[PDB]
Design a protein around this ligand. Sequence first.
Ligand SMILES: *[C@@H]1O[C@H](CO[C@@H]2O[C@@H](C)[C@@H](O)[C@@H](O)[C@@H]2O)[C@@H](O[C@@H]2O[C@H](CO)[C@@H](O)[C@H](O)[C@H]2NC(C)=O)[C@H](O)[C@H]1NC(C)=O
Ligand SMILES: *[C@@H]1O[C@H](CO)[C@@H](O[C@@H]2O[C@H](CO)[C@@H](O)[C@H](O)[C@H]2NC(C)=O)[C@H](O)[C@H]1NC(C)=O
Ligand SMILES: *[C@@H]1O[C@H](CO)[C@@H](O[C@@H]2O[C@H](CO)[C@@H](O)[C@H](O)[C@H]2NC(C)=O)[C@H](O)[C@H]1NC(C)=O
Ligand SMILES: *[C@@H]1O[C@H](CO)[C@@H](O[C@@H]2O[C@H](CO)[C@@H](O)[C@H](O)[C@H]2NC(C)=O)[C@H](O)[C@H]1NC(C)=O
Ligand SMILES: *[C@@H]1O[C@H](CO)[C@@H](O[C@@H]2O[C@H](CO)[C@@H](O)[C@H](O)[C@H]2NC(C)=O)[C@H](O)[C@H]1NC(C)=O
Ligand SMILES: *[C@@H]1O[C@H](CO)[C@@H](O)[C@H](O)[C@H]1NC(C)=O
Ligand SMILES: *[C@@H]1O[C@H](CO)[C@@H](O)[C@H](O)[C@H]1NC(C)=O
Ligand SMILES: *[C@@H]1O[C@H](CO)[C@@H](O)[C@H](O)[C@H]1NC(C)=O
Ligand SMILES: *[C@@H]1O[C@H](CO)[C@@H](O)[C@H](O)[C@H]1NC(C)=O
Ligand SMILES: *[C@@H]1O[C@H](CO)[C@@H](O)[C@H](O)[C@H]1NC(C)=O
Ligand SMILES: *[C@@H]1O[C@H](CO)[C@@H](O)[C@H](O)[C@H]1NC(C)=O
Ligand SMILES: *[C@@H]1O[C@H](CO)[C@@H](O)[C@H](O)[C@H]1NC(C)=O
Ligand SMILES: *[C@@H]1O[C@H](CO)[C@@H](O)[C@H](O)[C@H]1NC(C)=O
Ligand SMILES: *[C@@H]1O[C@H](CO)[C@@H](O)[C@H](O)[C@H]1NC(C)=O
Lengths: 116, 404, 186
Amino acid sequence: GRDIDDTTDAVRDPQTLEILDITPCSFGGVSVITPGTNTSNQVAVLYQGVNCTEVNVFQTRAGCLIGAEHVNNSYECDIPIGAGICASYQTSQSIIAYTMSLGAENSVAYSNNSIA
Amino acid sequence: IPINFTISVTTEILPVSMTKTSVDCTMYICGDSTECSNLLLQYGSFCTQLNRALTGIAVEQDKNTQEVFAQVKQIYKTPPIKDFGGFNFSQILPDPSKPSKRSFIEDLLFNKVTLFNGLTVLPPLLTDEMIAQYTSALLAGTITSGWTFGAGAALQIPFAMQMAYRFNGIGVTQNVLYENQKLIANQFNSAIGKIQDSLSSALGKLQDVVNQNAQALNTLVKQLSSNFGAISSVLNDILARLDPPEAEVQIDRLITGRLQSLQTYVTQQLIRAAEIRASANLAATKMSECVLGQSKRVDFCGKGYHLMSFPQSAPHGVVFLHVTYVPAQEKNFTTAPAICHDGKAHFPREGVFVSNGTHWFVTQRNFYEPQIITTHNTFVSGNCDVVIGIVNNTVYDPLQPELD
Amino acid sequence: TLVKQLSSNFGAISSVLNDILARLDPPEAEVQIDRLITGRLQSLQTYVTQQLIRAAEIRASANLAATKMSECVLGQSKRVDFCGKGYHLMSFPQSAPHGVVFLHVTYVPAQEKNFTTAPAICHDGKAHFPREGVFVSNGTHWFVTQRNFYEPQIITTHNTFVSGNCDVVIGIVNNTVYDPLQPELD
Ligand SMILES: *[C@@H]1O[C@H](CO[C@@H]2O[C@@H](C)[C@@H](O)[C@@H](O)[C@@H]2O)[C@@H](O[C@@H]2O[C@H](CO)[C@@H](O)[C@H](O)[C@H]2NC(C)=O)[C@H](O)[C@H]1NC(C)=O
Ligand SMILES: *[C@@H]1O[C@H](CO)[C@@H](O[C@@H]2O[C@H](CO)[C@@H](O)[C@H](O)[C@H]2NC(C)=O)[C@H](O)[C@H]1NC(C)=O
Ligand SMILES: *[C@@H]1O[C@H](CO)[C@@H](O[C@@H]2O[C@H](CO)[C@@H](O)[C@H](O)[C@H]2NC(C)=O)[C@H](O)[C@H]1NC(C)=O
Ligand SMILES: *[C@@H]1O[C@H](CO)[C@@H](O[C@@H]2O[C@H](CO)[C@@H](O)[C@H](O)[C@H]2NC(C)=O)[C@H](O)[C@H]1NC(C)=O
Ligand SMILES: *[C@@H]1O[C@H](CO)[C@@H](O[C@@H]2O[C@H](CO)[C@@H](O)[C@H](O)[C@H]2NC(C)=O)[C@H](O)[C@H]1NC(C)=O
Ligand SMILES: *[C@@H]1O[C@H](CO)[C@@H](O)[C@H](O)[C@H]1NC(C)=O
Ligand SMILES: *[C@@H]1O[C@H](CO)[C@@H](O)[C@H](O)[C@H]1NC(C)=O
Ligand SMILES: *[C@@H]1O[C@H](CO)[C@@H](O)[C@H](O)[C@H]1NC(C)=O
Ligand SMILES: *[C@@H]1O[C@H](CO)[C@@H](O)[C@H](O)[C@H]1NC(C)=O
Ligand SMILES: *[C@@H]1O[C@H](CO)[C@@H](O)[C@H](O)[C@H]1NC(C)=O
Ligand SMILES: *[C@@H]1O[C@H](CO)[C@@H](O)[C@H](O)[C@H]1NC(C)=O
Ligand SMILES: *[C@@H]1O[C@H](CO)[C@@H](O)[C@H](O)[C@H]1NC(C)=O
Ligand SMILES: *[C@@H]1O[C@H](CO)[C@@H](O)[C@H](O)[C@H]1NC(C)=O
Ligand SMILES: *[C@@H]1O[C@H](CO)[C@@H](O)[C@H](O)[C@H]1NC(C)=O
């Protein structure tokens, strides 16, 4: 059996004569988030293309970040992990992983007869 | 001289960024083999340069998007009271029912384009929801403040007065707006309706990019079933049929072919990324000059005299809806450069001298509204034997009747 | 990277040419020589392509710098966010190693004040529109002021121009106009 790009994705075993598929084992690159070797020596590894089922474990859309706590607040983006997530060292001290905030929530007092 | 006007809204499509892609140099060439990798080490560092170039392009895409869209300090919000003097920004402003918080036209645009062996695809730093949030902030700031929010703190102002000051910057006076507010509101609403009706029946600028980025990958993948002169285009087949003394004259041909394929791909991607970067710079300039202000440059923000623009977000691109002002119906008149009243020559201050056949009036250039020629519309300069086409009508002098 | 590419075999028996020429008899050294030639040509042909692309990018940036020098320094520009954020006044160039530094001086407003505003004044049936400014009010009286700095003045016949009658404008208020000629006429 083949696929769009001529790669064997199915096969029939000679003895039992049953249909089996083939799926490549999980791959992916490794990226490390560091706050600079002048402040601290901690890091946070992030497998890019694998879920956490495989090898403080937050599963993200961009991969499976390991070694960084997850917070609820929202700050500016220091280290752009991806898909709206950013990581920073400033929380005794630990690396956090939050969601990026675009800015303050403002609202002008618009009306039909007021000017500033 | 025109007697009537129309408001026209036109769209403009611009690509901003393309899909990020990182291609492994070792897994693409070899795979899981080890003899292939040991042979590949003899070529030096041709697997670090390619990865560095691809990472550079990947970072540049996010920089493009960030510099185009992130131009507002604070996320402004539209007030609930939608009394804008008749103008209806309902298909432009977001609808807080869909989970994506996207307006009608942004949905029409997002449903028009859409419908490992080394290669991966990385996710964008700014997800589509955040881009919609940015465009909504820009729209709410433009509507409720004008150009003030792009040049410091935001100052409120009623929309009708803002449009009056937008007319006053293209020559037409503001009583023209205030005395024809309903007609202008109706024309603007009709124009928005036509835009939404024409976006549902295109977007070739944003598709000729996806097509090229897809055929490049298709060619790269298809360049893996070529023999390149060896006996078979499978490393796991060669390694299972030849002893190591006599397989490194075959794997070497495979290595040469696959390296040349990767080099061609990387060069083409570098050139394409440069082109996209130029377009993103143009898009950022258009945003800064047409949205956060009113532009006097001709044919930059649309076709006609620019009034204002609104941004919308499209997949891997941006959409501008330029609002302009075009004169409609003209009429023939007769003109004189100056008037010789009493040995003096009266030139118009801001306007032009026209006559319908019997009497002479003074009127503004971009609209027709005649006025009597007083001494508050004209100024004197010399005698009337130098000007070439001077006529000899009379003026009003509005102080004489009151001095009785 | 280009320099370090000189210490790779590229398939030959060594990465140094003198060893190739000394250890081997001419007719069988040309194979090693050709392998080295191919490798080094590939290296020095990738370097030139990357350099050309970088040069084009730098050329675009230099063109932008020339335009900014021409339009922000030698004059005052109305293009928004081109010569800095805010309303532009002037700029000064400074030389830096392989670059330029512009110092953009800009006007930017400050502490605000909310007001009550109307688009016209109906004096005696006629409708008066501001000549150059905007109508404002502090609660009781009405003034006309410029749009970028609070500086109220008494509404007069010189600050306004007449147009039609006060029946078609949507929002309109009643007030008076000074008519400065009258006190001197008597
Ligand atoms: C400016 O005034 C607005 C409301 O205007 C009021 O009525 C006018 C007719 C005029 O007489 C003004 O002097 C009056 O104040 C107010 O806007 C509020 O600002 C506060 C700031 O904390 C905000 O919490 C409220 O939500 C605003 N009101 C609304 C309806 O949204 C305020 O007094 C002044 N605002 C600004 C921006 O200067
Ligand atoms: C200027 O043009 C507008 C439309 O472009 C005219 O408004 C129309 O007037 C007719 C007759 O009064 C109405 O039947 C229409 O409903 C109006 N609106 C439209 C959209 O057609 C307007 O009359 C023109 N001005 C003058 C002075 O004739
Ligand atoms: C040109 O326009 C002027 C003003 O619109 C016309 O002058 C008017 O003519 C009528 C006819 O008797 C008079 O009652 C008015 O007093 C005149 N002035 C104004 C301000 O209306 C003139 O008739 C027009 N000429 C042509 C050939 O159409
Ligand atoms: C609003 O402006 C008016 C116009 O100046 C002010 O009215 C005058 O204010 C001066 C200065 O205090 C007094 O000397 C006059 O007697 C005022 N005239 C009248 C008729 O009241 C007014 O005080 C300002 N403030 C308010 C709240 O109205
Ligand atoms: C400005 O908007 C106000 C609403 O805040 C308008 O007032 C409305 O309409 C009439 C006129 O006074 C009144 O019933 C109320 O003040 C408002 N109605 C309701 C149902 O709230 C006012 O007409 C507008 N004025 C201008 C000049 O635009
Ligand atoms: C031999 O292979 C056949 C399939 O061709 C299978 O049906 C059979 O059971 C096998 N023999 C034994 C002893 O299992
Ligand atoms: C490290 O940081 C401290 C202050 O945070 C600073 O004084 C010092 O120069 C830095 N050193 C390096 C090598 O960055
Ligand atoms: C990883 O595991 C989670 C949990 O079952 C699953 O939802 C997710 O789809 C898995 N990842 C992939 C790529 O299938
Ligand atoms: C943080 O968020 C999680 C889920 O979003 C919630 O269960 C938890 O209580 C929150 N903690 C704080 C301190 O807000
Ligand atoms: C704006 O248009 C929508 C549909 O086009 C309509 O439902 C709504 O009532 C309109 N609002 C105003 C104020 O005209
Ligand atoms: C002006 O006059 C010319 C020649 O008489 C004519 O062709 C033209 O149509 C006239 N303009 C208008 C607006 O009727
Ligand atoms: C235009 O030309 C005609 C005839 O050629 C002439 O009578 C008239 O004076 C000219 N108009 C000017 C010079 O303003
Ligand atoms: C206009 O009329 C005056 C009347 O005093 C006359 O002297 C002058 O020549 C006239 N101009 C032309 C161009 O005929
Ligand atoms: C202005 O005065 C006229 C005449 O007395 C009156 O009819 C009108 O209602 C006044 N304006 C307002 C807004 O009340």
